[PDB]
Amino acid sequence: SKSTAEIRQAFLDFFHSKGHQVVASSSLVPHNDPTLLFTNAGMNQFKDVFLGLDKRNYSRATTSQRCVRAGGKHNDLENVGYTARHHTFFEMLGNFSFGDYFKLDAILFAWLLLTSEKWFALPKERLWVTVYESDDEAYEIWEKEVGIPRERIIRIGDNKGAPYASDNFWQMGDTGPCGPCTEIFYDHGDHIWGGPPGSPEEDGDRYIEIWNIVFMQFNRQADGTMEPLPKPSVDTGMGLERIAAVLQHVNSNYDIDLFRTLIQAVAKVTGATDLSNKSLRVIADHIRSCAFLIADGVMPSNENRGYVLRRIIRRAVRHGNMLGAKETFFYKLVGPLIDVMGSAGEDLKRQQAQVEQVLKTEEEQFARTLERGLALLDEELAKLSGDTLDGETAFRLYDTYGFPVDLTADVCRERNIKVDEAGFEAAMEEQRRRAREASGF
Ligand SMILES: C[C@H](N)C(=O)NS(=O)(=O)OC[C@H]1O[C@@H](n2cnc3c(N)ncnc32)[C@H](O)[C@@H]1O
């Protein structure tokens, strides 16, 4: 079967052969978008094109975009290690139409690449599609133009409990380009738990969302109102890791060639032997987001972007500790990561030594309190009455040991213990008041 690198290239070759300009992945960090924490989709760097504020020499494009979803509008951090399909860092394979072609041709391109004997040749019978409930045009295209049996075309309304809050209406953020969308799912088989989209068991890893095709129609405002874009456009994105899993005949993203090699490296540096332990997958995921974010200019800190990075590094280090890592290990995964990323890791390779030292320094800094903080948390859990750790203890771990609340929550979750987030926030606010009182005017 094709390697991850070959799949990435074949996707780009396909759209290039269809007249799409190949554009390089943008950085994970925008210089000119105050509303965006980290790049979360291929469309981010073309936001102004969709808005009609910018025009390129090309009206159609294709990219393999590095994305991080660990904060802001799209945040999958807490899913990592718990599903076969979620990462913090991942590549989104995309094609874009800037007032060029629209619904029918976007759907046809996607179906062709996926199912043609000349291309990916996926078994058509295992593919399901969803459309926005009110998108009658998309429904008809799938039914009559493509020929998907009706039983595998699923209409999804505003299933997130609010107007335009839906799995089939995609939004870049609270503001920005958005529109109804249609998604293609692959059924991995009845040996995996889960049901199709719209079913009670839809959240399972059996029927996995491979490719989202967005019909960009509006610019959402802060009020929540939808202002139409000047030209209806197309924004698509397919998870490289998810399609690689399908193509390599495995069910989990973590079983693709890229992650198999990376997870082996994690076991090596931590001393772990059980290759099935979820901490190996969490760490393999976390090195990708951490190393690339640093390569793209983020430095660990206690505010904004730097704090998300710090949070992820420390959580990864914590997982390494649980695996029994005896010495500083996280920075040792940069080399192995570069070796599996191909041309998609060129920016990281260019800055290898710098990224390594940043990660080494951060882990060493955290090691000053990690073991001691874990010992305290263990003591507090051993005498804990109930299923919820008190907010005062969470705050103490934060204030004294530099444990982000979500890191503490991660440890507790592994023991079926919750954290009183409200109590933690009340303790934070109490400290803020003390600071205001002492500092004065
Ligand atoms: C096209 C659009 N702007 C968009 O971002 N749609 S989407 O949110 O659904 O993402 C495109 C895709 O990337 C993949 N994807 C999304 N979040 C992911 C994550 N946290 N980890 C791995 N893959 C993810 C999915 O295959 C998915 O259909």
Residue 230 tokens read as 């000047």
Residue 236 tokens read as 């698509």
- Do residues 172 and 122 both lie within one domain? yes
Q: DSSP assignment, residue 21?
A: E
Query: Which residues, at least 6 apart from 274, have a Cβ–Cβ distance to it below 8 Å?
Result: none
User: Which amino acid appears at position 163 of this protein?
Assistant: P
Q: How far is CA 35 from CA 38, 44, 71, 294, in A?
A: 10, 11, 12, 20
- Do residues 57 and 170 both lie within one domain? yes
- Do residues 291 and 149 both lie within one domain? no
Residue 10 tokens read as 């074949």
Category of 423 on φ-ψ map: left (φ > 0), alpha (ψ -120 to 50) or beta: alpha
Q: What is the resolution of this structure in A?
A: 2.1
CA 60 from centre of chain:
25
- Strand pairing partners for 189? none
| Burial class (CB within 10 angstroms; exposed 0-12, middle 13-18, buried 19+) of 194 | middle
184 φ/ψ angles, rounded to the nearest 5 degrees: -110, 125
Residue 97 tokens read as 């139409």
Distance 69 CA to ligand 1 centre (A): 9
| Burial class (CB within 10 angstroms; exposed 0-12, middle 13-18, buried 19+) of 233 | buried
Distance 292 CA to ligand 1 centre (A): 18
Could you say which of 218, 251, 284 is where a domain stops? 251
- State whether the Cα torsion 80-198-169-160 is positive or negative: negative
Could you say which of 226, 251, 276 is where a domain stops? 251
DSSP letters, 353-399, are: HHHHHHHHHHHHHHHTTHHHHHHHHHHHHHT--SSEE-HHHHHHHHH
Judged by DSSP in three states, 440 sits in: coil
Mutate to test the pocket of ligand 1, among 90, 211, 246 (most ligand atoms within 8 A of CB): 90
- Do residues 233 and 329 both lie within one domain? no
Q: Which residue, 45, 41, 38, is CA-closest to 93?
A: 41
Q: Which residue, 408, 430, 428, is CA-closest to 419?
A: 408
Q: Which atom of ligand 1 approaches the CA of 92 most closely?
A: 13
Q: Are the C-beta atoms of residues 186 and 142 closer than 8 Å to each other?
A: no
Pocket of ligand 1 (CB under 6 A): 41, 43, 69, 76, 86-87, 90, 92, 170, 209-212, 214, 235-239, 241-242
Exposure on the CB side of residue 202, measured as CA atoms within 13 A: 12
- Do residues 261 and 170 both lie within one domain? no
- Do residues 266 and 349 both lie within one domain? yes
Distance 26 CA to ligand 1 centre (A): 16
Residue 355 tokens read as 């990224």
Q: Which residue, 91, 107, 126, 110, is CA-closest to 246?
A: 126
Q: Are the C-beta atoms of residues 319 and 283 closer than 8 Å to each other?
A: yes
- Do residues 159 and 274 both lie within one domain? no
**In 10 A of CB 162, how many CB atoms?**
9
Instruction: Give residue 268's domain range.
Output: 252-441
Whole-angstrom Cα distance, residue 240 to residue 181? 19
- Strand pairing partners for 96? 61, 235
Mutate to test the pocket of ligand 1, among 75, 83, 109, 242 (most ligand atoms within 8 A of CB): 242
Distance 236 CA to ligand 1 centre (A): 9
Q: How far is CA 20 from CA 15, 234, 252, 325, 378, in A?
A: 5, 13, 30, 47, 56
Residue with tokens 């004065």, as numbered in its chain: 440
Q: Are strands 176-187 and 89-97 parallel, antiparallel or unpaired?
A: unpaired
CATH of the domain at 157: 3.30.930.10
47 φ/ψ angles, rounded to the nearest 5 degrees: -50, -50
End-to-end CA gap in the chain: 67
- Do residues 308 and 206 both lie within one domain? no
Distance 237 CA to ligand 1 centre (A): 6
* Ranges assigned E (strand) in 98-189: 127-132, 153-156, 169-171, 176-187
The residue nearest atom 3 of ligand 1, judged by CA position, is 41
Q: Are the C-beta atoms of residues 263 and 116 closer than 8 Å to each other?
A: no
Query: Which residues, at least 6 apart from 72, have a Cβ–Cβ distance to it below 8 Å?
Result: 36, 37, 38, 40, 173
Q: Which atom of ligand 1 approaches the CA of 42 most closely?
A: 3
Q: SS3 sequence, 253-300?
A: HHHCHHHHHHHHHHHHHHCCCCCCCHHHHHHHHHHHHHHHHHHCCCCC
Residue 166 tokens read as 């839906």
- Do residues 223 and 282 both lie within one domain? no
Query: Which residues, at least 6 apart from 406, have a Cβ–Cβ distance to it below 8 Å?
Result: 77, 78, 311, 315
The residue nearest atom 4 of ligand 1, judged by CA position, is 237
Work out how many domains the chain is built from and give that number: 2
Residue 111 tokens read as 């179906």
- Do residues 75 and 91 both lie within one domain? yes
- Do residues 242 and 384 both lie within one domain? no
The residue nearest atom 5 of ligand 1, judged by CA position, is 41
Distance 240 CA to ligand 1 centre (A): 9
In 127-218, which ranges are continuous DSSP H helix? 136-140
Q: DSSP assignment, residue 134?
A: T
Q: Which residue, 16, 41, 15, is CA-closest to 30?
A: 41
Q: Which atom of ligand 1 approaches the CA of 212 most closely?
A: 28
Distance 398 CA to ligand 1 centre (A): 32
DSSP letters, 202-230, are: TTSSSEEEEEEEEEEEEEE-TTS-EEEEE
DSSP letters, 49-102, are: HHHTS---S-SEEEEEEEEE-EETTEE-GGGTTTSSS--SEEEEEEEEESSS--
- Strand pairing partners for 381? none
Q: Which atom of ligand 1 approaches the CA of 94 most closely?
A: 1
Mutate to test the pocket of ligand 1, among 212, 243, 255, 292 (most ligand atoms within 8 A of CB): 212
Could you say which of 224, 251, 278 is where a domain stops? 251
- Do residues 182 and 209 both lie within one domain? yes
